[PDB]
Design a protein around this ligand. Structure first.
Ligand SMILES: O=P(O)(O)C(O)(Cc1cccnc1)P(=O)(O)O
Ligand SMILES: O=P(O)(O)C(O)(Cc1cccnc1)P(=O)(O)O
Ligand SMILES: [Mg+2]
Ligand SMILES: [Mg+2]
Ligand SMILES: [Mg+2]
Ligand SMILES: [Mg+2]
Ligand SMILES: [Mg+2]
Ligand SMILES: [Mg+2]
Lengths: 336, 336
């Protein structure tokens, strides 16, 4: 399934680049480069979720060649949206690598031009929806879903960045309540709600209450996914994660620091105060050592188990009348 | 009219900030700040063009309070789009001031976070269209117009930036053909076509051929407007323009350098080669002095006259069945 999804990318790049209007040539070329470098090399889970859910929600007699093409394309739209956000997120977080290669903006000859490049990736979403879904009943529902999920992700990023001012001790700000708001908005809407909801609209499941019920499950899964992202920022294997962690030196409201603040002794609070939020390797190591001294890996592992049980309880409550398998396949993939 | 348009901004900021969901509070606050700093202080010509054209194209018996509100809001959408692009353009062009104050990203405590802030301004366009135009016949036409004009502006910005690589002599690239493509895409679609076309759709003028005819006039006006922007980058009064010029030190394909290359002697070409595209004030002054020695102000002034006559000839050819006054009021404003 992931090999089939990735094979459809050649076709996407081909239709996005067919406007070559020789004049715009050299920017179409650059657009190819941005797409090749930036939407390829991930696991493709968010885009595949659209396709998997589409096949589970749509009656097989309605799954002809062209409706399947529209599903693959919408899944690539979700991946282009993630590519838009990541590019810009790597600039703002001062990140070094992404998916096992240097962040696009560190590429010599790119730099802050990456800002345009990211806006273009966003623009491609709507070009693809027009090329493929324009005459479908769900066209406007999808455009609106993508725009709303962007807005919600940018609100989240705003909070992320206001809670993490550079060069400024922000520990008082780092609370559970605040953390939960950050991750709801910055990650949960676009990573989980968006692709399932997109498949739902394509299948003609438009009801407010069915979308609300699906959202109840999916926003909690997204919360877990971001907690996991925070854990792996520091404790993940960078040959697996494909990215260097910057949360400590970026002064982020990570699940780790939140959990640390609620366990630290007043001596340990001062260690964090003196070392969090700074570029010095030795300072970052003191924080990591405090996390390790507080058995934060053990705490994450227990949370992963408790979170799983909680999400499965919500699937029991809220999945119907959708197939639980939609949610269960997602759970398998993120608690893997 | 500009005082009425500006008065409606309080209401726009109020509806954009009514989601205060206490959790997202502090990002709504920041969103207010971004809107107050970044969509205010211009001349508002692009947003007013929507309103002026709306009143001229819509039968007065159809211009009730609420349809007029929708026109003011769509005009603010066009201004939010310009605010999105300028913010990001000031980062990528390394600009110092905008509208008589420091560029938002130079504000201490903003910096590259301005990237998110700009994406949020874009997002506000679609929130306003949904809040105000959702049940109108032209809703989808407007969303599609705004998205398309963004795409086209980002393609233009891509070309602008590829033709102007930092630290790299690009004079061979700087041709009339290339310049015309740049400005068509980066400026002409969103500054002129966009607001008139928006008013056209609101008035129920949806025809392909009427939009094409309007576009014929408006893209040429936009070409002139960018040529004027290039001229004033170096020769404008910064107490009038409100911005410091960076085209020479940014290595831009400005109308000025294009015109200089077609008049320069081989000695003068080498002066440009040795001094264009560099941060040193003394080098920038050599280029300005070469422009002045080539009587480029005199050339711009003659071009302004010839361009005016050309645009008026196109209004004669292509305005009907729209009122010429729509185009003539625009011409007055840009050749002012
Ligand atoms: O991939 P990253 O940078 O670890 C992350 O998950 C990326 C991201 C970007 C935009 C929204 N949500 C998450 P972050 O929040 O920066 O820790
Ligand atoms: O306001 P500026 O920076 O003079 C400009 O007109 C701004 C701009 C931004 C985006 C698209 N078109 C023009 P530019 O092209 O940068 O010279
Ligand atoms: Mg990041
Ligand atoms: Mg981030
Ligand atoms: Mg992370
Ligand atoms: Mg600029
Ligand atoms: Mg520019
Ligand atoms: Mg300029």
């Amino acid at each position: 399934e992931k090999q089939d999804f990735v094979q459809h990318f050649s076709q996407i790049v081909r239709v996005l680049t067919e406007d070559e209007h020789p004049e715009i040539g050299d920017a179409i070329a650059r657009l190819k480069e941005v797409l090749e470098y930036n939407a390829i090399g991930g696991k493709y889970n968010r885009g595949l979720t659209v396709v998997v859910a589409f096949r589970e929600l749509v009656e097989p007699r309605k799954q002809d060649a062209d409706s399947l093409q529209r599903a693959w394309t919408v899944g690539w739209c979700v991946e282009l949206l993630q590519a838009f956000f990541l590019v810009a997120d790597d600039i703002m977080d001062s990140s070094l690598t992404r998916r096992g290669q240097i962040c696009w903006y560190q590429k010599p000859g790119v730099g802050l031009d990456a800002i345009n490049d990211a806006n273009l990736l966003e623009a491609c979403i709507y070009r693809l929806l027009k090329l493929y879904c324009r005459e479908q009943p769900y066209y406007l529902n999808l455009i609106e879903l993508f725009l709303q999920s962007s807005y919600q992700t940018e609100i989240g990023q705003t909070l992320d960045l206001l809670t993490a001012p550079q060069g400024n001790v922000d520990l008082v700000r780092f609370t559970e309540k605040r953390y939960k708001s950050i991750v709801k908005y910055k990650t949960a809407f676009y990573s989980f709600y968006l692709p399932i909801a997109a498949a739902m609209y394509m299948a003609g499941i438009d009801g407010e209450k069915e979308h609300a019920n699906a959202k109840k499950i999916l926003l909690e899964m997204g919360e877990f996914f971001q907690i996991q992202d925070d854990y792996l920022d520091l404790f993940g294997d960078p040959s697996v994660t494909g990215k260097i962690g910057t949360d400590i030196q970026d002064n982020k409201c990570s699940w780790l620091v939140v959990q640390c603040l609620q366990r630290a002794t007043p001596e340990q609070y001062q260690i964090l105060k003196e070392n969090y939020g700074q570029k010095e390797a030795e300072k970052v190591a003191r924080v990591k050592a405090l996390y390790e001294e507080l058995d934060l890996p053990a705490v994450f592992l227990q949370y992963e188990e408790d979170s799983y049980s909680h999400i499965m309880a919500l699937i029991e409550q809220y999945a119907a009348p959708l197939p639980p398998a939609v949610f269960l396949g997602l759970a398998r993939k993120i608690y893997k």
